[PDB]
Design a protein around this ligand. Sequence first.
Ligand code: M3P
Ligand code: M3P
Ligand code: M3P
Ligand code: FE
Ligand code: FE
Ligand code: FE
Ligand code: FE
Lengths: 288, 296, 288, 297
Amino acid sequence: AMTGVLRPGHAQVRVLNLEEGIHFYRNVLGLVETGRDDQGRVYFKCWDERDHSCYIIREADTAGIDFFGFKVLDKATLEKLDADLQAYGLTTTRIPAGEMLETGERVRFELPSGHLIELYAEKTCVGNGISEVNPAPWNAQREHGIAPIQLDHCLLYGPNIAEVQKIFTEVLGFYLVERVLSPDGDSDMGIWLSCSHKVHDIAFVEYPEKGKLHHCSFLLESWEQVLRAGDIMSMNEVNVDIGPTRHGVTRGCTIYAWDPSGNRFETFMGGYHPYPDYEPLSWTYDNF
Amino acid sequence: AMTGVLRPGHAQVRVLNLEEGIHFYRNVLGLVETGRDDQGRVYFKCWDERDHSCYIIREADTAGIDFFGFKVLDKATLEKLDADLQAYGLTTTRIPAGEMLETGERVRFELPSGHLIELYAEKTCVGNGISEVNPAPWNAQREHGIAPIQLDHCLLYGPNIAEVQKIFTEVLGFYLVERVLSPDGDSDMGIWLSCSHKVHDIAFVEYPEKGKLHHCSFLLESWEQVLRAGDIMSMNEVNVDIGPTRHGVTRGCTIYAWDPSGNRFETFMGGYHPYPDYEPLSWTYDNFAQGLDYPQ
Amino acid sequence: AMTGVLRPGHAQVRVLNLEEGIHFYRNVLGLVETGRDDQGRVYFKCWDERDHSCYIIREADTAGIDFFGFKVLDKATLEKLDADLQAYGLTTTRIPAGEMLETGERVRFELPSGHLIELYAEKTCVGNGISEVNPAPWNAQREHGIAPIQLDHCLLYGPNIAEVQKIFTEVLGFYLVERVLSPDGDSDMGIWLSCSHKVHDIAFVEYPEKGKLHHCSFLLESWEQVLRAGDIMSMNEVNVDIGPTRHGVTRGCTIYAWDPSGNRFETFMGGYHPYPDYEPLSWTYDNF
Amino acid sequence: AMTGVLRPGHAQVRVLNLEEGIHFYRNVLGLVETGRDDQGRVYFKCWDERDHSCYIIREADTAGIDFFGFKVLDKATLEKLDADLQAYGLTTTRIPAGEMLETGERVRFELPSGHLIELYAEKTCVGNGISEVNPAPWNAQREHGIAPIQLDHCLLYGPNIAEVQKIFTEVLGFYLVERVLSPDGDSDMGIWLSCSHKVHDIAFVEYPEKGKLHHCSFLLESWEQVLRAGDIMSMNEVNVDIGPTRHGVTRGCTIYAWDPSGNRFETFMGGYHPYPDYEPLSWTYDNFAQGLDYPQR
Ligand SMILES: CC(=O)/C=C/C=C(/O)C(=O)O
Ligand SMILES: CC(=O)/C=C/C=C(/O)C(=O)O
Ligand SMILES: CC(=O)/C=C/C=C(/O)C(=O)O
Ligand SMILES: [Fe+3]
Ligand SMILES: [Fe+3]
Ligand SMILES: [Fe+3]
Ligand SMILES: [Fe+3]
């Protein structure tokens, strides 16, 4: 049974230029635009997802991540986690339903690494553009731009990863899948946590400046889709960070590229199938 | 988080000739043999899995499945589930630890469909044959025979699917991902159940005879692997049921073939990513064909 | 060097309904329409080919193939081939330039199996839509319907395949790549012929009826494009013959399906790389 | 019909250590060893090819390529080519048959770029390890190391590429498929030549030093095989030049890596289907400067 925290639900990122951000995410990445609110933020969802949104961009004077939200099983679970976060010593804030289009109230809190995390139980299901009866495997949207399958996770750069692990494993029901060791001084320089049977729903790398966003990740169907994504990036003049390649950690075959505003994102596929009862895999600093 | 029933743990199948069963499953399908007990049962597991076994064969008068077990989160969970099963009205049997090689105690019970289901919390962890520190992407095992990644699920044939569904969803925390409706005067002729975010961990099809096994399924990495599996089957003159194709119900790209004793198995990959908050997908009986084989 | 007969140039097929044929080939298979003549024929080419046409449709009262042409190196070669065919004992007809849109004169003749074959040295090159300078990876045409890369070959059914083989190898410059032996008759039941280094540019199977067409084939880029083609066929309710699979002969991974008129076409990829110095592979009849 | 020069036939490369060279080529790249002659050379062929050899290694003081040869249709063609090569103004030297294991005599000559090219019509056929009757699509060989399918081509670095182009297109029956234009004093800084319907059978890049070998190339079955090759390289600590990536000057998806001796080779798949009647594609120098075959890089 999947319970408690289910999956990454949304990432709100800052773009130095809205209209340009809308163009790149709609035509290059191929996210489906679902709405635009009064604040001027525009909502997107991957084609095969069913909820109203997973990626929200906001015009601002600085690039980066405002916050990262997770969907939880139900309202009861949301209330419990809220109380658990507080019992743990974290101060929670409650964002009202509607504050974000088609989204219920959210429980927000700040990690020691400086990042803002949200938890919510409700978000309107809009569907994946395919009928619920005798559904096709895909439709035209699958080939509009890169067209990723789902918001897979994000990797965050922050100062107190050690205590961040505790919050996630002891309060949020996540578990360590992989980690990178420090130079023998044995302190996880980085961690890959899962709250399902995926290699990771979120990751953290130890960093001096808090609240930094390394990248938001989008899942693709096959290695050939990663190849196609690279061609679309090239044809649209997208600034690529590190070309298509196999990633040691999580066995991911990915591509790192930057959007107009300088936000790094990933399109990948691959990875094993860990479960709560598995012991994490480790990587020596020299390998990292 | 993944709690309660985590995933398919093992399937013990009956084979006519134990020796050919070993050869086929070790050399053709590519399972890693991990043991043989005193009752004459050989233990296999997929190379990338970590637990001691997921597939166990036994020489018997007839082919088919003896039982299908699921691994649960923890002992407290095992005891808890066993309690709810009884409180539900199902009589449960307690199989002691060790009865199965490298396996802990299991909670076994029979379904309305006639199939025997087990629940267990402990199974020795042997690893995937790759190092725990700075692991390689894969190894030679990945190319020994078909070499599937995990026991994905199984599809069972038996009566009273409606009742079977209620047990899985109301007691074992599963949820319906897809169903194939009966003709008019609706009811479900087929159901695909998930206890995770996989399209299905197990499925049932309404059939008059009970305790029947349609197939056990093994997960592959890609579509090219599915074609490779096809070639390997041909090279070993393995009887293939439905060649490489797309399902529709699950979107799974697969191939069905038979082992030497007539037991159908499957090697596939693909599918979307359902979660418990999702509403099930429905297929009409009239459009059943496309649901079973999409391209055709 | 590639000389003599270079490659399959065009197949003109008969459709029971021009309208349904235009829609099917242009939007399901994803061929690119390049013209229509005052005779009511529609011209198509695969998007990545450079010549004006490779597949022509003509509304008639019966499905099937009218003729199949091959492009040769140059005019001198065309004349040479015409002379050799007649010196061989065959009667030739010369079709003038322009009888077919954007096409030069053609040399036509009938095979003992009843099929009409043509040879031509000139056909307007129109390009693949991509620039000849710094060509972008690929365009949108790549994903318009199935979108095959080239007319790969055709498979013809008819009698006297033995006589047909001699004409192609002794006169036209092809060589036998693969064969299916007949049941102790010491006469091949099927032949796969190449005039390049492709597994085959044309193939014949022994059959009582004369001039029959089994299928025209189109090449795809990968096994996954084959899966995609099947998906597209299902989506457009296309009637599929043999599901995605691998051919023993050629090693090709394919799908056979029918157009609205009952004409079988193929979408496949794969196969080894034979050369004129290679010996043919053989398949026992009992292992067809 | 495929006539005249048919395809790359063999490449003899120099390795600093004959032993580690044999292990790398039979275990990592997955080439099939077919022999070892008196001179100390070890011969290999790709599993799916049918002739005795396509890659030969020779222990030497320096790394690089000794010569690159093409197989021609038949003996008559070999004689004709030799005559046309001399008629053109090149001096040719006939290498005796048997000088190379299982290889007939060869017509050797030097290009203006300094590279030695050979032509031969006969080389013993040893098969691809698969039955000639009811042949399977592949076997264990396909999964031994990377296991390339064929010696696809090579890319040489040397001067006077203009004169090399003339020789290949006017005498050897090849044609230009792609080119890289010079910054502006227009000419060609790079050329990709074909003697078939492949994107290229051989390529040259204008470079001051004569006889330079950029890389020999090996063809793979699919994009996933390239990814696989990447994993095998990482596992064997192979020195990778430029990881899996989409080319451009061929639409190829490839990986450039090095021999333990420092010989660069390529494992790729992909590309379109040019024919003799086609006009070449062009790349601006500034584009080439960002590609994988740029002298700097
Ligand atoms: C520091 C860094 O980028 C590591 C990322 C790990 C992953 O598994 C992925 O990106 O899929
Ligand atoms: C027609 C039928 O029985 C269902 C086929 C779909 C499946 O996902 C399976 O068998 O695992
Ligand atoms: C006569 C028949 O059914 C088999 C044909 C084999 C092939 O490889 C093809 O058609 O490309
Ligand atoms: Fe990532
Ligand atoms: Fe199944
Ligand atoms: Fe065909
Ligand atoms: Fe190359």
